[PDB]
Amino acid sequence: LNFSGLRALVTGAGKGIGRDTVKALHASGAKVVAVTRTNSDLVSLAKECPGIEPVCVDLGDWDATEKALGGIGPVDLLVNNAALVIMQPFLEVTKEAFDRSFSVNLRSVFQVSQMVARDMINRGVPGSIVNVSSMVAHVTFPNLITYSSTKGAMTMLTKAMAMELGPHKIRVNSVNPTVVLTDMGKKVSADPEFARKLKERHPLRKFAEVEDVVNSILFLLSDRSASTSGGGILVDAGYLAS
Amino acid sequence: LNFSGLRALVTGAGKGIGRDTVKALHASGAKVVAVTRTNSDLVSLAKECPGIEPVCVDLGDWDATEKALGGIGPVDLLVNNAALVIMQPFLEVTKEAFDRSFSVNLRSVFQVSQMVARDMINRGVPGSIVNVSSMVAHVTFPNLITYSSTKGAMTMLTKAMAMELGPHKIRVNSVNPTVVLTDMGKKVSADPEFARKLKERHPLRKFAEVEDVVNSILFLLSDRSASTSGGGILVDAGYLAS
Amino acid sequence: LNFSGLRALVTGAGKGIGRDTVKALHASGAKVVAVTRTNSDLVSLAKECPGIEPVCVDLGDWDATEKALGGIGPVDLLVNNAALVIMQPFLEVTKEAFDRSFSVNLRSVFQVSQMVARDMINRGVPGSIVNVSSMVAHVTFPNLITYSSTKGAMTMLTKAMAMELGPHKIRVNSVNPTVVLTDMGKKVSADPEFARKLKERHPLRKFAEVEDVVNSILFLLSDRSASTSGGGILVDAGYLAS
Amino acid sequence: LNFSGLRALVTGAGKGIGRDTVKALHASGAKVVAVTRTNSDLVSLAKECPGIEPVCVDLGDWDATEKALGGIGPVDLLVNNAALVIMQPFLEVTKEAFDRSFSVNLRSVFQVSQMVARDMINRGVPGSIVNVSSMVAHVTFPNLITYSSTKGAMTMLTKAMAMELGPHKIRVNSVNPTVVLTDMGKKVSADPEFARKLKERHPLRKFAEVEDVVNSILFLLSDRSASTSGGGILVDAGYLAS
Ligand SMILES: NC(=O)C1=CN([C@@H]2O[C@H](COP(=O)(O)OP(=O)(O)OC[C@H]3O[C@@H](n4cnc5c(N)ncnc54)[C@H](OP(=O)(O)O)[C@@H]3O)[C@@H](O)[C@H]2O)C=CC1
Ligand SMILES: NC(=O)C1=CN([C@@H]2O[C@H](COP(=O)(O)OP(=O)(O)OC[C@H]3O[C@@H](n4cnc5c(N)ncnc54)[C@H](OP(=O)(O)O)[C@@H]3O)[C@@H](O)[C@H]2O)C=CC1
Ligand SMILES: NC(=O)C1=CN([C@@H]2O[C@H](COP(=O)(O)OP(=O)(O)OC[C@H]3O[C@@H](n4cnc5c(N)ncnc54)[C@H](OP(=O)(O)O)[C@@H]3O)[C@@H](O)[C@H]2O)C=CC1
Ligand SMILES: NC(=O)C1=CN([C@@H]2O[C@H](COP(=O)(O)OP(=O)(O)OC[C@H]3O[C@@H](n4cnc5c(N)ncnc54)[C@H](OP(=O)(O)O)[C@@H]3O)[C@@H](O)[C@H]2O)C=CC1
Numbered sequence: 008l009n010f011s012g013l014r015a016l017v018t019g020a021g022k023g024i025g026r027d028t029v030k031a032l033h034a035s036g037a038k039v040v041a042v043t044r045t046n047s048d049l050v051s052l053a054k055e056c057p058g059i060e061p062v063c064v065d066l067g068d069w070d071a072t073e074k075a076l077g078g079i080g081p082v083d084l085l086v087n088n089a090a091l092v093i094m095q096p097f098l099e100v101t102k103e104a105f106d107r108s109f110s111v112n113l114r115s116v117f118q119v120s121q122m123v124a125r126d127m128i129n130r131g132v133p134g135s136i137v138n139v140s141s142m143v144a145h146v147t148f149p150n151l152i153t154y155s156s157t158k159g160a161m162t163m164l165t166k167a168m169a170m171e172l173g174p175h176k177i178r179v180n181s182v183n184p185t186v187v188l189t190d191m192g193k194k195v196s197a198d199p200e201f202a203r204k205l206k207e208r209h210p211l212r213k214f215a216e217v218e219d220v221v222n223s224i225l226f227l228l229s230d231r232s233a234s235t236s237g238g239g240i241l242v243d244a245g246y247l248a249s
Numbered sequence: 250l251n252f253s254g255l256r257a258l259v260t261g262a263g264k265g266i267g268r269d270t271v272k273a274l275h276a277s278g279a280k281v282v283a284v285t286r287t288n289s290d291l292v293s294l295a296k297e298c299p300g301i302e303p304v305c306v307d308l309g310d311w312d313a314t315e316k317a318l319g320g321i322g323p324v325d326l327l328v329n330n331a332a333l334v335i336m337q338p339f340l341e342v343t344k345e346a347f348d349r350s351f352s353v354n355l356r357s358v359f360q361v362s363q364m365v366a367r368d369m370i371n372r373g374v375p376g377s378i379v380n381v382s383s384m385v386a387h388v389t390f391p392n393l394i395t396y397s398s399t400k401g402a403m404t405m406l407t408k409a410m411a412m413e414l415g416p417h418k419i420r421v422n423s424v425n426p427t428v429v430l431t432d433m434g435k436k437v438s439a440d441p442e443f444a445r446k447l448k449e450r451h452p453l454r455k456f457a458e459v460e461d462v463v464n465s466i467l468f469l470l471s472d473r474s475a476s477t478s479g480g481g482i483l484v485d486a487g488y489l490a491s
Numbered sequence: 492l493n494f495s496g497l498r499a500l501v502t503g504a505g506k507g508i509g510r511d512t513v514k515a516l517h518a519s520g521a522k523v524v525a526v527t528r529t530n531s532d533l534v535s536l537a538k539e540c541p542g543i544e545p546v547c548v549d550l551g552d553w554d555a556t557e558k559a560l561g562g563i564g565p566v567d568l569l570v571n572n573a574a575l576v577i578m579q580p581f582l583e584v585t586k587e588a589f590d591r592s593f594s595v596n597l598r599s600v601f602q603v604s605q606m607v608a609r610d611m612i613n614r615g616v617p618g619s620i621v622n623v624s625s626m627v628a629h630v631t632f633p634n635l636i637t638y639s640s641t642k643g644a645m646t647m648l649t650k651a652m653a654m655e656l657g658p659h660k661i662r663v664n665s666v667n668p669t670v671v672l673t674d675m676g677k678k679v680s681a682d683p684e685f686a687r688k689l690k691e692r693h694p695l696r697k698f699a700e701v702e703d704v705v706n707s708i709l710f711l712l713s714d715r716s717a718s719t720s721g722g723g724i725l726v727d728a729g730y731l732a733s
Numbered sequence: 734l735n736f737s738g739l740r741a742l743v744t745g746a747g748k749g750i751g752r753d754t755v756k757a758l759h760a761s762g763a764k765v766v767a768v769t770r771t772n773s774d775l776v777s778l779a780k781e782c783p784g785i786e787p788v789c790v791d792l793g794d795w796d797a798t799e800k801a802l803g804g805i806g807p808v809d810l811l812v813n814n815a816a817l818v819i820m821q822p823f824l825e826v827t828k829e830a831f832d833r834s835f836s837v838n839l840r841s842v843f844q845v846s847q848m849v850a851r852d853m854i855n856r857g858v859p860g861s862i863v864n865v866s867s868m869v870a871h872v873t874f875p876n877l878i879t880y881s882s883t884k885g886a887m888t889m890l891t892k893a894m895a896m897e898l899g900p901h902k903i904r905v906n907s908v909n910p911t912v913v914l915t916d917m918g919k920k921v922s923a924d925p926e927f928a929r930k931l932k933e934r935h936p937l938r939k940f941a942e943v944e945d946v947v948n949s950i951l952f953l954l955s956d957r958s959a960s961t962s963g964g965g966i967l968v969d970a971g972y973l974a975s
Contacts, residue, residue, distance in 0.1 A: 069828045097897045098847055098854075102795045105840055113882070114831055121824050128824075144889060147732050147896040155893050156839070156886040163870060163885025169490040170873040171823045173452025178487075185476070210415025215476035222473040231464040234427070234457035237490030238483040240474075245420075248411040248479030248631055311586045339655045340605055344553045347598050355640070356589055363582055386647065389974055394651040398597070401647025402640045405628065409639050412631040413581045490873055650974040657936025657971045669960070694899025699960035706957040715948045716966075718911070718941035721974030725964040729899045732892040732963030 008229045011036030015228070016082045018066060018119060019089030021048025023189030024139060027217050028086055028224055030056055035225070040079055042066070042119075043089070066115035067107060073118070081130060082123045084228045087116045088139040090157070092191055094150040104153055112157035116164060120179075124172055133176035135228045138165050139220075140181040142243040151195065158183075162239075169237030180227045181239035185246045186214040210245030250471050253278030257470070258324045260308060260361060261331030263290030265431030266381065269459050270328055270466055272298055277467070282321055284308070285331070308357035309349060315360070324365045326470045327378040329358045332399070334433055336392040346395055354399035358406060362421075366414055375418040377470045380407050381462075382423040384485040393437070400425075404481075411479030422469045423481035427488045428456040452487030492713045494521035499712070500566045501525055502550060502603060503573030505532025507673030508623060511705050512570055514540060519709075524563050526550070527573070550599035551591060557602070566607045568712045569620040571600045574641070576675055578634040588637055596641035600648060604663075608656055617660035619712045622649050623704075624665040626727040635679070642667075646723075653721035664711045665723035669730045670698040694729030734955045736763035741954070742808045743767060744792060744845060745815030747774025749915030750865060753943050754812055754950055756782055761951070766805055768792070768815070768845075792841040793833060799844070807856060808849045810954045813842040814865040816883070818917055820876040830879055838883035842890060846905075850898055859902035861954045864891050865946075866907040868969040877921065884909075888965075895963035906953045907965035911972045912940045936971030 015032050019025035021043035029041045033056040040060045041052060049061035064075040066089050090112045093104040120136060127134040143151055144158035161181060168179040186192045186205065192214065196202040206214060223240045226232055241247060257274050261267040263285030271283050275298040284304040285291055291303035306317040308331050332354040335346040362378055369376035385393055386400035403423060410421040428434045428447065434456065438444040448454060465482045468474055483489060499516050503509040505527030513525050517540040526546045527533055533545035548559040550573050574596045577588040604620055611618035627635055628642035645665060652663040670676040670689065676698065680686040690696060707724045710716055725731060741758045745751035747769035755765050759782040767775055768788040775787035790801040792815050816838045819830040842864055853860035869877055870884035887907060894905040912918045912931065918940065922928040932938060949966045952958055967973055 097894060098851060100843055100847065102840075102844075105843060109835055114828075117823075117826055117831060117879075118828075121826065125824060147889075147893045149897075152890070152893040152897065153843075155889045159889030160882045160886035162888075163873075163881045164878070166490045166885075167873045167878040167881050168823060169487045170452045171875075171878065173487045173490070174454060176453070178453070210412045211418075211420070211476065211478060212416060213476070219474070219476040222475075223477070226468055226473070231468070232461070232482075232484075233464075234453065234455070234461040234484045234486040235465070235482060236453060236487040237485070240477060240482055241480045242474075242476045243479075244476045245411045245415050245478040248408040248415075339652060340609060342601055342605065344598070344602075347601060351593055356586070359584055359589060359637075360586075363584065367582060389647075389651050389654040391655075394648070394655065395601075397647045397651050398644040402644035404646075405631075405639045405643030406636070409631050409636040410581060413636065653971045653974040654936045657974075658938055660937070662937070662971075694896045695902070695904070695960065695962060696900060697960070703958075703960040706959075707961070710952055710957070715952070716945075717948075718937065718939070718945040718968045718970045719949070719966065720937060720971040721969070722967045724958075724961060724966060726960050727963070728960045729895045729904075729962040732895040732899075 008035050008225055010084070013083040014038040014040065014081055015084035015086065016040040016042065016079070016123060017086040017088060018042045018115065020052065021045050023191065024187065024217055024220050025088040026052060027221050028088065029059060031221050031225060033059060037084065040082065067110040069114065069118060072115060076119060076122055082126055083132060083134055085120065085123045085136040086139065086224055087119060087136065089115060092151065092154050092195060094195065095153065096150055097152045100153055108153045108157050113160055113164065116161065120168065124177055127177055128175050136177065136179045137224050137227050138179065138181040140183045140239060142183050142185045142241060142246050144183060145247060165239065166237050173236060178236035180235060180237070182220055182223045182227070183239045183241045183243065184215045184220050185209065185243040187217055187220060188214060189217060208246065208249045210248055213244050215242050215244055250277050250467055255325040256280040256282065256323050257326040257328065258282040258284065258321065258365065259328040259330060260284045260357070262294065263287050265433060266429065266459055266462050267330040268294060269463050270330065271301060273463050273467060275301060279326065282324065309352035311356065311360060314357060318361065318364055323372060324368055325374060325376055327362065327365045328381065328466060329361060329378065330381040331357060334393065334396045334437060336437065337395065338392055339394045342395055350395045350399050355402050355406070358403065362410065366419060369419055370417050378419065378421045379466050379469045380421065380423045382425045382481060384425050384427050384483060384488050386425055387489060407481065408479050415478060420478035422477055422479065424462055424465045424469065425481045425483050425485065426457045426462045427451065427485040429459055429462055430456060431459060450488070450491045452490055455486055457484050457486055492519055492709055492715070494519040494568065497567040498522040498524065498565055499568035499570065500563065500607065501570040501572060502599065503527060504536065505529050507675065508671065508701055508704050509572040510536060511701050512572065512708055513543060515705050515709055517543060521568065524566065551595040553598065553602060556599065560603060560606055565614060566610060567616060567618055569604065569607045570623065570708055571603060571620065572623040573599060576635065576638050576679060579637065580634055581636045584637055592637045592641050597644055597648065600645070604652065608661055611661055612659050620652070620661065620663045621708050621711045622663065622665040624667045624723060626667050626669045626725060626730050628667060629731060649723065650721050657720060662720035664720060666704055666707045666711065667723045667725050667727065668699050668704050669693065669727040671701055671704055672698060673701060692730070692733045694732055697728050699726050699728055734761050734951055736761045736810065739809040740764045740766065740807050741810035741812065742805065742849065743812040743814060744841065745769060746778065747771050749917060750913065750943055750946050751814040752778060753947050754814065755785060757947050757951055759785060763810065766808065793836040795840065795844060798841060802845065802848055808852055809858065809860055811846065811849045811862040812865065812950060813845060813862065815841060818877065818880045818921060821879065822876055823878050826879055834879045834883055838880070839886050839890065842887065846894065850903060853903055854901050862894070862903065862905045863950050863953045864905070864907045866909045866965060868909045868911045868967060868972055870909060871973060891965065892963050899962060904962040906961060908946060908949045908953065909965050909967050909969065910941045910946050911935065911969040913943055913946055914940060915943060934972070934975045936974055939970050941968050941970055
C-alpha cells in the first residue's frame with residue numbers, strides 16, 4: 008500500500024508480529040517509530056530498515072513510557088502490539104502475574120493511545136489505531152486465563168475508543184489471531200499433543216502466519232477500510248467456527 | 250489487486266454493491282460472471298465492463314437458478330450479494346414477504362454456494378466465498394425484522410460453511426455494512442428525521458460508501474486474508490460501538 | 492412459581508421439552524393450550540394434565556395454523572418450541588429440507604407470535620414470549636447447517652421482537668440448550684464416538700436435562716425476570732466456554 | 734428458593750445490589766458472609782439480618798484481603814459483586830484511575846474466586862459463583878471506558894473460569910444489568926438529558942430494579958440452573974436489542 012508521508016508508531020517492535028509490521032510499513036513509505044523492550048532488537052532492526060526511530064522502553068512502566076514517548080512528535084498510525092504471556096492455571100494465578108499482564112497488555116494501550124490521539128486531534132488529522140488482540144478475547148485457552156482477560160478487556164477498550172474518538176475521524180480496530188508461531192506462539196503450544204489436537208480443531212487445519220496478521224493490520228491502517236471502526240478482524244484460521 | 254486468471258461469480262450484479270464489485274474485479278483482471286434479475290442492467294454493465302459473462306435469472310427460483318448456472322463452468326471466487334428488503338413492522342409481516350425474503354436472501358446463498366463449492370472441490374483448487382450480510386445481523390433496525398432475520402441466519406450459514414469447507418481449503422466470510430446509499434439504502438433510510446438520528450448515532454457520523462464495502466469484499470476474496478474464515482468484517486462506520 | 496390466572500400456549504407440546512413445559516405450567520396453575528402435530532400425543536397428555544386445551548395442527552402450514560389458532564383467545568405466556576431437525580452435510584442440503592426447516596422452525600414463530608402479541612396489545616396486558624433456540628445459533632455442529640441457520644435467524648427474530656414489542660411491555664427471550672436426550676438429541680448424537688467426544692468437550696462433562704431447559708423457560712416467563720428481554724439463557728453445560 | 738445448609742459470601746455487601754443479595758440469601762436460609770469496605774454498613778446490615786458474618790476489608794488490597802478471608806471457612810455460593818466507577822472520558826484516564834479500577838473490579842474477583850474454589854475442591858463439593866458484570870461489557874457508555882474495560886475482562890474471566898472449574902462441578906456465570914438506581918446508578922446517569930435519552934432507547938422504557946438483578950443472581954446460584962455456566966443473563970431491560 009502507500010503510507011508515504013505518514014508516520015507510524017509500533018509497540019513491541021523487537022520481535023514477531025511487531026517487527027514484521029515495522030518492516031512492512033517501512034517498505035510502504037511510512038516513517039516508523041519502533042518501540043520495544045530489548046535494545047539489541049532495535050539495533051538489528053535499524054540495520055535492516057534504515058531510517059526508523061528506535062525507542063527502548065518497558066511499556067509496563069507508566070513513568071518511563073511517558074518520558075520516552077511524551078515528545079515523539081506527530082503520529083498518524085498506531086499499532087498497539089506489545090504484550091506478554093504468563094501461563095498459569097486459574098488456581099495458580101499470582102498477584103505479580105496479574106499486575107504485570109495488565110500493565111503491559113492493557114494499561115500501556117490506554118497510555119500510548121491517549122498520547123497519540125491527543126496529537127491527532129491537535130493537528131486536526133484523521134488517524135487509524137490497531138490493537139493487536141487475540142482469538143482468546145472470545146474463546147478459552149488452557150493456562151491463559153490472565154492473558155485472555157487482558158484481551159477480553161481490549162475488546163471493550165477498542166469499542167469504547169472507537170465510540171469516543173470516532174467524531175474526531177480516528178478509527179480504532181483490533182486484529183484477533185489464533186496461534187502464530189513467533190516466540191509467543193511456540194511458548195503456548197509447547198505441548199506437542201495439545202498443538203496437534205489444537206491445529207486439528209481449526210477448520211483450515213493450520214495456524215496463522217505472521218504475514219497473515221501483518222496484512223490485516225495494514226488493511227485496517229489504510230484508507231481501504233474507511234468505514235471500519237470498533238470491531239476486529241479474526242485471523243483465526245476459522246477457529247471460532249469450530 | 251491481481252485477480253488475473255481467476256474466474257468470479259457475483260450475484261445481484263445489476264445495481265449497487267454488486268455492480269461495483271463486478272467493476273472492481275473486472276478492473277483487477279478476473280473473468281467475471283454477473284448474475285442479476287433485470288436483463289437491462291446486464292446490457293449497460295457489459296458496455297462498461299467489456300468481457301463480463303451476463304446471466305439473467307431470478308435467484309428466488311431454485312429450478313430456474315439450477316438451469317441458469319448448472320453449466321457456467323469454473324468459479325474461483327464467489328460473492329453472494331443479491332438480496333431484497335421488504336419493509337414491514339413485526340405485526341404486519343405476511344407469509345409472502347417472509348417466503349420471498351428467505352428464498353432470495355438465504356436459500357439462493359445455499360444453492361449457488363453448493364454449486365460453486367462442488368466445482369472448486371472437484372478441480373482441487375482453493376476458493377474464497379464472500380456472503381454480503383448486514384450490521385442488522387447483529388443490531389435491530391425499524392421495519393426490517395424479516396430482512397434482519399435472513400441476515401441473522403447468514404451469520405451461522407457463514408460460520409457453518411467455513412467449518413465444513415475449511416478442510417477443502419475454501420474460505421467463507423461475510424461483510425456487514427451499515428446503511429450504504431444505493432437503491433436499498435435510500436429506501437431503508439427514507440424518513441429524514443430517522444436518517445438524521447441514525448447518522449448521528451454512528452461514531453464516524455456518516456454512512457458507508459459503496460467503495461468501502463467493495464474494498465472489504467476484495468480483501469476477503471484475496472490471498473491477503475489467507476487465515477480469515479468463518480466471521481466477518483464490519484463496514485458499519487462504528488455503529489456496533491454506539 | 493405461580494402462574495394462576497394466566498393462559499399459556501406451548502407449541503410442539505406432544506413430546507420432549509414442550510411436553511414437560513406444559514406439565515410444569517399446568518402444575519403451576521396456568522391454563523395451557525397445547526399445540527402439536529401428532530394427535531395421539533395430545534390424547535395421552537390430556538389424561539396426565541386434565542384441563543389443557545389440545546390443538547392438533549402442522550405449524551409448517553400457514554393456513555392450517557391460522558385456522559387452528561386464529562380464535563384461541565387470550566394468551567399471556569407463549570413458548571415457541573416446535574422444531575424439526577433434518578440432518579444433511581452442506582453439499583447435500585436440498586430445497587425440500589430448507590423449505591420444511593424454515594417454515595416449521597422459524598415462519599411458525601413469526602405467525603404465532605404475531606397473533607399472540609396482537610392479543611396482548613389489544614387487552615393492554617404485559618406478556619412474556621420464550622423462543623426455544625439452541626446453542627447452535629452460536630456454535631457449529633456437524634450435519635446441522637440448515638437447522639443451525641434457522642436458530643441463527645432466531646437470535647435476530649428475538650432481538651427485533653424485543654425491540655418492537657418492548658414499549659407494549661411484552662418481553663421476548665430465548666433459551667439456548669446444548670444436546671438434551673429427547674428424541675431430537677438422540678438422533679443428533681446417534682454416533683457413539685461423536686457423542687463421547689462432544690460430552691468431553693463440555694466443561695460440565697454432561698448434556699443438559701429436560702428439567703434444566705424447562706426451569707429457564709419458566710424463569711423467563713415469570714415476573715422474576717422483569718428486566719430481561721432481547722437475549723437468551725445458555726443451557727449449554729458450558730459448551731460455549733470450550 | 735431454599736439455600737438451607739449452605740454458606741454464601743457476598744462482596745460489596747454494604748450497599749445496593751450486594752446488600753439486597755445478602756438479604757435475599759439470608760431470607761432463603763443460607764449463612765451469609767458479608768464482605769464490604771465501610772464497617773458501619775455491616776453494623777446496620779447485621780441488625781436487619783441477624784446472624785450474618787461481617788468482614789470489613791478493602792478488596793483492592795491483595796494482602797489485606799488474603800488475611801481477612803484466608804480463614805473464613807466453607808463457602809458454597811459466591812457473589813463477586815464489589816466494584817467502583819471512576820468516570821473519565823478516554824483522553825482523561827489516569828494511571829491511578831486505571832489501577833484502582835482493575836484492582837477492585839477484577840483483581841479481587843480472581844483472588845476471592847481462587848480462595849473459594851480451592852475450598853470447594855478441597856471439600857469435594859459442587860459450587861456456584863456469580864460475577865456481577867454489566868451490560869457495558871458489551872455496549873459502550875460515555876465516561877465509562879475504564880469501568881467498561883474491567884467488565885469486558887470479566888466476560889473472558891467468567892468464560893475461562895467456567896472452562897477450568899467445570900470438571901470440578903463448579904458453575905460460573907455473570908449477570909449483566911443496565912443502569913440500576915443504586916448510588917452507582919445515580920452517579921452514572923447524573924445528567925438528566927442523558928438519562929432521558931438513555932431510558933428512551935431501552936425497548937422496555939425503564940431501568941432495572943435491584944430486585945431484578947437479585948432475582949437473576951439467585952436463579953444462577955440455585956440448582957434450577959444446573960446446566961448453565963460460562964455466560965451470563967442480561968438484566969438490561971432490552972438495551973442490547975436497541
Ligand atoms: N504468537 C501468537 O500465537 C499470538 C500473538 N498475539 C498477539 O500479537 C502481539 C505480538 O505477539 P508476538 O509477535 O507473537 O510476540 P513476541 O513475543 O514474538 O513479541 C512480543 C514483542 O513485544 C515486546 N514487549 C513485551 N513486553 C514489552 C514491554 N513490557 N515493553 C516493551 N515491549 C514489550 C517484546 O519485547 P521483548 O522480547 O524484548 O520482551 C517483543 O519484542 C501481542 O499483542 C500478542 O498478544 C495474538 C494472537 C496470537
Ligand atoms: N444498501 C444498504 O444499506 C445495505 C446493503 N446490504 C447488502 O448488500 C447487498 C447489496 O445491496 P444493495 O447493493 O444496496 O442493493 P440494490 O437494491 O441496490 O441492488 C441489489 C441487486 O440484487 C439484485 N437482486 C435482488 N433480488 C434478486 C433476485 N431475486 N434475483 C437476482 N438478483 C436479484 C437486484 O436486481 P433487481 O434490481 O433487478 O431486482 C439488484 O441488482 C445485499 O445483500 C444487501 O442485503 C447490507 C447492508 C446495508
Ligand atoms: N434435544 C436437543 O438436543 C435440543 C432441542 N432444542 C430445541 O428444543 C425444542 C424442542 O426440541 P425437543 O423437545 O428435543 O424435540 P422433540 O422432537 O423431542 O419434540 C419436538 C416437538 O415439537 C413438535 N413439532 C415438530 N414439528 C411440528 C410441526 N410441524 N407442527 C407442530 N408441531 C411440531 C413435535 O411433534 P411430532 O413428533 O408430532 O412431529 C414434537 O411434539 C426445539 O425448538 C429444538 O430446536 C434445542 C437444543 C437442543
Ligand atoms: N448500579 C448500576 O447502574 C449497575 C451496577 N452494576 C454492578 O453491580 C455491582 C454492585 O453495584 P451497585 O450495588 O450499584 O454499587 P454501590 O456503589 O451501590 O455498591 C457497591 C458496594 O461495593 C463496595 N465496594 C466497592 N469497592 C470496594 C472495595 N474496594 N472493597 C470492598 N468493598 C467495596 C461498596 O462499598 P463502599 O460504599 O463502602 O465503598 C458498596 O458497599 C457492581 O459490580 C457494579 O459494577 C452493573 C450494572 C449496572
